[PDB]
Amino acid sequence: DTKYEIMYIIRPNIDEEAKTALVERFDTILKDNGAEVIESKDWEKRRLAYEMNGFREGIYHIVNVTSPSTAGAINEFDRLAKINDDIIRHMIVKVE
Amino acid sequence: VMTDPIADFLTRIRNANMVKHETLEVPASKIKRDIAEILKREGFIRDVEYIEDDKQGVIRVFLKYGKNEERVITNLKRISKPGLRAYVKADEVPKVLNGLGIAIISTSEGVITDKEARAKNIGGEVIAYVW
Amino acid sequence: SQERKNEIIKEYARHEGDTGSPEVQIAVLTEDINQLNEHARTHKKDHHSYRGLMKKIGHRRNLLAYLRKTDIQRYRELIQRLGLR
Amino acid sequence: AIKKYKPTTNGRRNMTSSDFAEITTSTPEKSLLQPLKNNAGRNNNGRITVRHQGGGHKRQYRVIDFKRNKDNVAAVVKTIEYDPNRSANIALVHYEDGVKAYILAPKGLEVGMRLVSGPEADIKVGNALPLENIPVGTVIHNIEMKPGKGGQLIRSAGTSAQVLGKEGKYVLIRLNSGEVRMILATCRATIGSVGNEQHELINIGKAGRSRWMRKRPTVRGSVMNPNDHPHGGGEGKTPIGRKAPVSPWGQPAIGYKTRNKKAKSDKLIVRRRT
Amino acid sequence: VDYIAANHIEYIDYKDTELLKRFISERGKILPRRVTGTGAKNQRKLTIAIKRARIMGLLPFVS
RNA sequence: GGGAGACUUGAGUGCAGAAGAGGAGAGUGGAAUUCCAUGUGUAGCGGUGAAAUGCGUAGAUAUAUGGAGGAACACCAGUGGCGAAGGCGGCUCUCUGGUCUGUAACUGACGCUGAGGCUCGAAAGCGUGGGGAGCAAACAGGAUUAGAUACCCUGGUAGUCCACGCCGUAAACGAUGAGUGCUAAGUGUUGGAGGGUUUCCGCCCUUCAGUGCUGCAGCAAACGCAUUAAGCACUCCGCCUGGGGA
Ligand SMILES: [K+]
Ligand SMILES: [K+]
Ligand SMILES: [K+]
Ligand SMILES: [K+]
Ligand SMILES: [K+]
Ligand SMILES: [K+]
Ligand SMILES: [K+]
Ligand SMILES: [K+]
Ligand SMILES: [K+]
Ligand SMILES: [K+]
Ligand SMILES: [Mg+2]
Ligand SMILES: [Mg+2]
Ligand SMILES: [Mg+2]
Ligand SMILES: [Mg+2]
Ligand SMILES: [Mg+2]
Ligand SMILES: [Mg+2]
Ligand SMILES: [Mg+2]
Ligand SMILES: [Mg+2]
Ligand SMILES: [Mg+2]
Numbered sequence: 079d080t081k082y083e084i085m086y087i088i089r090p091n092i093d094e095e096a097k098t099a100l101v102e103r104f105d106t107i108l109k110d111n112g113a114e115v116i117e118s119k120d121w122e123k124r125r126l127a128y129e130m131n132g133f134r135e136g137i138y139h140i141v142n143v144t145s146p147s148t149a150g151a152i153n154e155f156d157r158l159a160k161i162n163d164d165i166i167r168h169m170i171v172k173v174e
Numbered sequence: 175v176m177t178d179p180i181a182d183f184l185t186r187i188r189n190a191n192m193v194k195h196e197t198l199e200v201p202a203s204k205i206k207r208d209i210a211e212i213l214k215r216e217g218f219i220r221d222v223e224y225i226e227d228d229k230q231g232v233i234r235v236f237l238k239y240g241k242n243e244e245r246v247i248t249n250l251k252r253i254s255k256p257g258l259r260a261y262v263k264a265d266e267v268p269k270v271l272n273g274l275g276i277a278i279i280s281t282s283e284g285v286i287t288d289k290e291a292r293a294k295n296i297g298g299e300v301i302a303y304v305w
Numbered sequence: 306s307q308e309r310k311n312e313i314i315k316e317y318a319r320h321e322g323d324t325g326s327p328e329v330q331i332a333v334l335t336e337d338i339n340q341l342n343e344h345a346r347t348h349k350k351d352h353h354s355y356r357g358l359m360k361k362i363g364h365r366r367n368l369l370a371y372l373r374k375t376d377i378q379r380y381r382e383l384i385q386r387l388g389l390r
Numbered sequence: 391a392i393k394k395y396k397p398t399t400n401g402r403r404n405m406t407s408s409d410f411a412e413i414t415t416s417t418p419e420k421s422l423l424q425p426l427k428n429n430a431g432r433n434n435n436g437r438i439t440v441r442h443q444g445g446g447h448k449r450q451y452r453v454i455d456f457k458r459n460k461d462n463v464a465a466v467v468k469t470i471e472y473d474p475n476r477s478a479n480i481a482l483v484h485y486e487d488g489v490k491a492y493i494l495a496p497k498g499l500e501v502g503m504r505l506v507s508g509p510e511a512d513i514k515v516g517n518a519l520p521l522e523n524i525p526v527g528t529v530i531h532n533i534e535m536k537p538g539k540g541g542q543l544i545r546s547a548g549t550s551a552q553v554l555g556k557e558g559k560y561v562l563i564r565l566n567s568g569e570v571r572m573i574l575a576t577c578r579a580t581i582g583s584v585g586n587e588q589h590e591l592i593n594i595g596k597a598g599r600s601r602w603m604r605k606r607p608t609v610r611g612s613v614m615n616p617n618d619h620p621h622g623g624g625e626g627k628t629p630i631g632r633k634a635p636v637s638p639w640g641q642p643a644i645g646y647k648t649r650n651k652k653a654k655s656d657k658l659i660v661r662r663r664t
Numbered sequence: 665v666d667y668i669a670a671n672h673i674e675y676i677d678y679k680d681t682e683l684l685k686r687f688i689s690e691r692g693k694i695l696p697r698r699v700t701g702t703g704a705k706n707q708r709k710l711t712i713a714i715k716r717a718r719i720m721g722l723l724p725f726v727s
Numbered sequence: 728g729g730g731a732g733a734c735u736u737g738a739g740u741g742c743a744g745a746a747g748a749g750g751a752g753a754g755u756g757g758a759a760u761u762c763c764a765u766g767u768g769u770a771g772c773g774g775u776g777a778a779a780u781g782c783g784u785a786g787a788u789a790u791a792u793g794g795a796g797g798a799a800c801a802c803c804a805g806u807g808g809c810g811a812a813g814g815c816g817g818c819u820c821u822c823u824g825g826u827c828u829g830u831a832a833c834u835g836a837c838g839c840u841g842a843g844g845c846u847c848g849a850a851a852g853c854g855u856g857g858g859g860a861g862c863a864a865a866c867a868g869g870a871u872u873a874g875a876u877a878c879c880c881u882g883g884u885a886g887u888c889c890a891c892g893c894c895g896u897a898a899a900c901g902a903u904g905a906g907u908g909c910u911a912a913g914u915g916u917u918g919g920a921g922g923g924u925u926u927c928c929g930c931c932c933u934u935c936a937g938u939g940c941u942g943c944a945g946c947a948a949a950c951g952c953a954u955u956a957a958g959c960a961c962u963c964c965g966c967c968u969g970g971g972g973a
Contacts, residue, residue, distance in 0.1 A: 082820090085679070085720065112681040121679070128757080136721070152820065156754075161513060161525050167756090169720050170820065171678075175737065175839045175907050177962040182908055189910045192959075193944065198909090201736080229736045257962065284836040314741075318833095324741035325833035333740080345749090352847060353750035353810075357824035359846075362826055364739080371837040554795095591855080670928045687803095694803040704807070704917070705746080711803050712818085718757075719818060725757045726802095 079144045082113075084154055085121065086159060086168035087136040100164050101139060106157060111154045113145035131166050142173070180205060181252040184302055187219075191237055191247050202231030208285035209301070210235060212278055216287065218247050218304060251303040253277070263297040275305025309336070317386070326389050327372040328383050334365040392591050394653075405595025408588060414469045414501060419482055422492055424451040427474070427602065446604030449474040453492040456532060456540035458518035458578055460577060461508030463487050466514070470495050470585075477547035478584045486635060494532055494545060496582030507578075515582035521553070521561040522575040528553045530579035533563065537576040548590060550583030560658065568663035571655075668706040676709045678716040684723060688714060692724045 086104075088097055105115050126136050132149040145151045152170055158170045183206050190198040202224060210233055210265060213219040220238040224231060228260055238246040252258040262268065262279070267288045270277050279289040281298035291298060310333055314324060317332040331332060341358045369389075373380040384390070391411065397403035430444030432534040452473055464482035471492075473480045483505065493505075496515045505511075507518035513528060520537075524530060529550050532541030544551045544566055549655040560572035594600055597607075611619035614629060619638050621630060635643040667686065668676070676683070687695050687702075687710050696712055697707040717723040 087721065124722075126721040127718075128721060130721055138720075147821070153753085156820080160754085167720060169716065169755095169818085171716065171818095172820080175962080177839080177907075178960085179908090181961045186909055189959055193910060195910085200909095227736095228734090230734085252960075255961070310741095322741095323833060325739070325835090329838075330740055330834080330837095330897070341823075348751045348822070351751040354822090354824045354888065355750090356811080356847080357750095360825085368739085368837065375835095375837080665928075672927065683898095689802085691802085693801085696803070696805085698805080704805080707803075708747090712802095714803080715756090715818060719755080 079114075080147050081144045081173045082170055083173045084141045084143060084152075084155065084168060084170045086139055086141075087126075087130070087140055087166040088139055089131075089133060089164055089166055090123070090135040090137060092137075096164075097137065100162075104159065105141065107155055107158055108141070108145075108151050111145075111151035112149040113143045113151035115141060115143050117142040129140070133166055136162055151174055178252070178256055179203060180301060181207070181255065182218075183209065184250040184252055186203075187235065187237075187247065188250050190235075191245055194239060194243060194245065195237065197234060197236050199232055199234050202233045203230070205280070205285065205301075206233055208280075209278055212276075212285065212287060213247075213304065216276055216304075244246070248305045253300040253303055260300045261297065262300050264292065264295045266297060267292045270303045271305050275303060278304065279304045313338065317383075326335070327368050327375070331365055331368045331372070331383060332387060334361055334368070335389070337361055392588055395595070401596040401598070403595075404593055405599075406591070406593040408586075408592060410472065412495075412585070413472050415471060418450070418452060418471060419490055421490055422453045422482075424453055426451040430604075440511045442606045442608050443604060444606050445601055447474070447602050451475060452480060453494050454480060455493055456534070456542070456545075457538065458493070458507045458532070458541070459490065459538065460485060460491075460578065461506070461511075464504045464506050465491070465493075467499060467501050467503045467505065470499065470503065476545070477586065478545065479547075479586050494541075494580070495585040496531060496580060497548070497550075497585040497587060498582065499585060513581055517581045518578050519581070520575065521563075521573060521577050521579055522556070524553050524561075524579060524581065526553050526555055528581060529583050530581055531584045532580040533573060534577045534579070535573065537574060539576075540576065541580065543567050544579075545584060547584055548587035551579075562660065566641065569659065570661040570663075572658040572660060666706060667700070668684045668702060668710070676706075676713045678713040678720070679722065680713075681717060681722045684714050684717055685712070688723065692718075692726055 088100065089116045092100065099119065101120075105118055108115050119139070121138045121140040123135070123137045126133060130136070143151070156168065156170060179201070183200050186200055188200055190299050207222075208223070210219070210222040212224050213235075218238060221236040223234045223236075231289065235257060240246055267279065268277055270287065273289070278301040279286055279288055279291045279298040280301055281291055281294075281296050283294060283296060286294075286298075313332050313336055314329050317327045317328045318324075319328055323324065323329060338361055341354070344356060345355055348354070359388070369380065369384075372383065391409050392406050393409045394406045395402045426449055428444060428446065428449075431438050431440035431442070432444075433439045452471075452475065454473075463486040465485045465587075467481050469482045470664055471480050473492075476494075480492045481495040481499055483491055485491065493516070494658060498515050503514075503516055505514075505516040505518075505579045509520060509523045511517040511519050513525065514521075518532075521530075529552055531544040531550055533543040533551060533614050535543065546566075549566040551566055552564045554564055554570065556562065556575065557572070558576050561575045562570065563573050563579075564570050594603075611621035612630075614622035616623035620632065620636050620640055621628075623630065632647070637643055641648070669719070687700060689695055694711060697704065700707075702710070714723060718725050
C-alpha cells in the first residue's frame with residue numbers, strides 16, 4: 079500500500095457539529111472505498127495567506143491514510159471534496 | 175567490445191613506450207605470452223613476468239630504454255587483423271627494416287620470428303611487425 | 306512488483322537459488338512484456354515507455370536464441386511453459 | 391464507431407454508417423411500444439404544412455420517461471437499444487419495484503448501472519436531480535423548463551449543457567447552442583451527456599437512404615416558376631435578383647431573425663447564440 | 665551553511681511554514697541556493713514544499 | 728573454423744540503495760493579458776526617430792470591485808537534471824521506461840555492430856471535430872521612401888492550443904556513427920559509495936558514473952582536439968571522389 083496524507087480546508091463559518099459530521103462523512107468515504115484511515119486530526123485554524131473562495135480564514139484538517147494504489151479511495155475523496163462546498167481546498171500527497 | 179586482444183596488447187606497449195612508462199600490465203593469454211617472450215629474447219623489452227589471478231592471469235612488461243632514455247621499440251604494427259587475416263607462404267615471409275626489425279609469425283611450429291620461420295622454411299600468420 | 310518477480314523466479318529456477326539463468330530471465334522478461342503491453346494499449350502515445358518494451362523484447366529474443374543454440378531441449382521446454390513461438 | 395463501406399457501387403461510394411456496437415439488443419419492450427403514424431407534414435386540415443416530409447420506414451413509438459420523477463427506488467440499466475424516433479439511443483431500465491421504463495442513454499452508460507433520481511442521488515451519469523442540487527460546472531442533459539413537465543432540452547445525440555451558477559430561484563445554464571439562460575431551480579436534469587456522439591459524422595451516401603429516413607426531395611426556389619416562388623422564373627440560371635433571398639413566402643432567408651421580439655423568456659435569457 | 669543539513673532533517677513537510685519562511689524573501693519569492701548556502705538536493709525539496717504551501721494557502725504567492 | 732569440456736573479467740539477473748522538467752492519463756493553483764458588468768472620473772489615451780492611422784464626450788485611458796475564458800508556468804533556475812534523438816520546467820495523483828552506485832548470490836560469452844526493414848522524429852503544413860486569451864503569416868490602414876508589394880505604427884485571419892490521423896523534413900549541430908581498450912595533470916559542479924576525522928553540521932582522503940573549464944604527450948593545413956580526443960589501436964555500419972547544370 080501507499081501512504082497518503084490529505085490536508086483539506088473546511089470553511090470557517092461551518093458549525094462545530096456540522097464540521098464533525100463533514101469529517102465523519104469523508105472518513106467514511108475513504109474507508110468504504112477501501113482505504114484505511116490511520117489518523118485524522120483538526121490540525122489548526124489559520125488565516126489564509128491569500129483569499130480562497132472569498133475566505134481569508136479556514137480550518138485545516140489532516141487525514142493520514144494508507145490504501146492500495148489501484149484502489150479508488152483517493153480519487154473518490156477528491157471527487158466528492160471537489161463537489162462539496164464545505165471544503166475550500168484539499169491536497170493529497172504521498173508520504174514515504 | 176574488444177575484438178583483437180593482440181592488437182590491444184601491441185597498442186598498450188606502444189602507448190606506454192610513447193610516454194616512456196617503465197612498465198605496463200595486460201590480461202594474460204597464450205598468444206600474448208608468446209609475443210612477450212619473443213620481445214624479451216629479441217631485446218626489445220627489458221623483462222616479462224606473469225601474475226596468476228582468478229580471471230585469466232596478468233602479464234607485466236618492463237619496457238627497455240637505452241642510454242639517454244632512448245626508446246628501444248620504434249613502433250609496433252598489427253598486420254593480421256580479424257577483419258582481414260594475413261597469411262604468408264614460406265617464401266613470402268617479409269623483412270622488417272631489412273632485418274633491423276622483426277615480424278612475429280604464428281606457424282604450425284609455434285609463434286616465431288621471421289628469421290626463424292625462413293630458417294625452417296615454413297609460412298604462417300603474420301601477427302605483427304616490430305622495430 | 307518484487308513479490309510477483311520472486312514467485313516467477315522460484316517457479317522457473319533451474320535449481321535452488323538460481324536467480325540468473327536463461328529460463329528465469331526469459332520468464333521474468335515475458336511477464337514484464339505482457340504487463341507492459343497492456344500499459345501500451347492503454348497509453349498508445351507513451352512512445353518513451355514503448356522504447357523500453359522493445360528493448361526488453363530484443364533482450365528476451367537474444368536469450369531465446371542463446372538458449373536454443375546451447376540446449377535445444379531446454380529451449381523447447383521453456384517455450385512450451387511460457388506459451389511462446 | 392463509424393464504418394465506411396467500400397465503394398462497390400456508385401451509390402455505396404463514400405457512404406458511412408454506425409456499427410451499432412453499443413446497441414445490446416434489437417427487441418424493444420412490448421409494454422412501452424406505442425403506435426405512430428407518419429403525418430408526412432400534413433395537419434388536421436390535410437394541407438402540407440411542412441414541406442419535404444413523408445414516406446420512409448414504418449416506426450413504433452417508444453415511451454421515454456423524460457420526467458425521471460420516480461425517486462423511491464433504483465433503476466438498473468438492462469439494455470441499450472436503437473430508437474427510430476430520435477438520434478440518441480435509449481436505455482431500458484428496470485426499477486426494483488418491477489416498473490419498466492425507457493430513458494435516454496447518456497454517454498458512457500453501461501448495462502448494470504443502478505441509476506437513482508431525487509435530491510439525494512449522487513452526481514453520477516444517468517442520475518436525475520433538481521437543478522438546485524447539481525453542483526456548478528456539471529454537465530447535464532434532458533433539462534425540463536417547467537417543474538414536473540419532463541425533460542425538454544438537451545436530448546439530441548451527443549448534446550450536453552453545463553451548469554454555470556445559481557441566482558434567486560433560477561439556475562444559470564449554458565445550453566448546447568451556446569446560449570446562456572436562467573432555468574427554474576426546481577427543474578430536473580440528468581447528469582452526463584447524451585450518448586451516440588458519433589451520430590453527426592454519418593454520411594448518408596445516397597438519395598434512397600434519405601427517403602428511408604422520411605425526407606422528401608427539396609426543390610430549390612430558383613428553379614420554380616414566378617407564381618411558385620419569389621425566386622422562380624427568369625431565362626436560364628438566374629441569380630437571386632432580389633434585395634435578399636427569401637423563403638417561398640417571402641421571409642428573408644439569410645440573417646433575418648425570427649424570434650418574437652416581445653418574448654416573455656427574454657427576461658430569463660442571459661446571453662443569446664444562434 | 666546548509667541549514668537543512670545542519671538541523672539534520674531529511675523530510676521537508678510543507679506544513680512547517682516556520683521552516684519554509686526562512687527560505688523565501690520579502691514579496692514571497694524563493695531564495696537562490698547560492699544565497700542561502702544550501703545544496704542542490706535540499707533546494708529542490710524546499711522548492712516543492714514551498715509551492716505546495718502556496719497552493720494550500722499556508723504561504724503567499726506574492727507580497 | 729568445427730566438435731567435447733572448463734572459466735568469470737564482457738553481458739545480463741538477483742539483492743541493497745540514489746537522482747531526475749523521462750513518458751502517458753486525469754485533475755488542480757497563482758500572477759498577468761484581453762473581454763464583459765458595475766462605481767468613480769474627465770479629456771485625452773496609445774504610439775514613433777518624428778508622426779499619423781487607431782481608441783475616446785455614444786464618457787475613453789486610468790482607477791476599484793467582481794465575472795468569463797484561453798494560453799504559458801515568474802521567483803526556484805544552476806556550461807543544473809533527465810531522455811537514443813526530436814525534446815522535457817506550476818502542483819497533485821494514477822500508469823510507466825531508462826539510468827547510476829554498491830554487493831558478489833546467480834547464468835556462464837548469452838556480446839558489438841547491423842544493409843534491407845520497423846519505430847520514433849522541432850517547426851511549419853495537411854484532414855476531421857473542437858477551442859481561441861495573448862501572439863501573429865496573409866491582409867487593411869498610417870508612416871518612411873525616388874519607389875517600399877519591407878523594415879516602423881495601429882489592427883488582424885489561418886496558425887499557434889486540444890483529440891485523432893497524416894506528413895517525415897531542419898545549421899534535426901558537438902556541423903564530430905556505434906562499441907571496446909590504452910595514453911600526464913589541474914580545477915569546478917550533479918548523483919552515489921567507502922574510510923579518517925569531526926559531538927553533529929561539517930572538513931580531509933579514496934572511488935564510480937555524469938558534467939564543465941584549463942592543459943602535457945600525441946595529432947592537425949591551420950584553426951584547434953587533448954581520459955567527454957579530432958591521440959594510440961581493433962570490429963561493424965553510413966558516407967565522399969573538381970565547380971556548375973542539380
Ligand atoms: K469545494
Ligand atoms: K454515393
Ligand atoms: K436512431
Ligand atoms: K435541392
Ligand atoms: K430560371
Ligand atoms: K523510475
Ligand atoms: K489543424
Ligand atoms: K536541436
Ligand atoms: K569531475
Ligand atoms: K564536369
Ligand atoms: Mg426542408
Ligand atoms: Mg422551370
Ligand atoms: Mg411573386
Ligand atoms: Mg428571379
Ligand atoms: Mg443568362
Ligand atoms: Mg505543429
Ligand atoms: Mg504587426
Ligand atoms: Mg537533410
Ligand atoms: Mg569526469
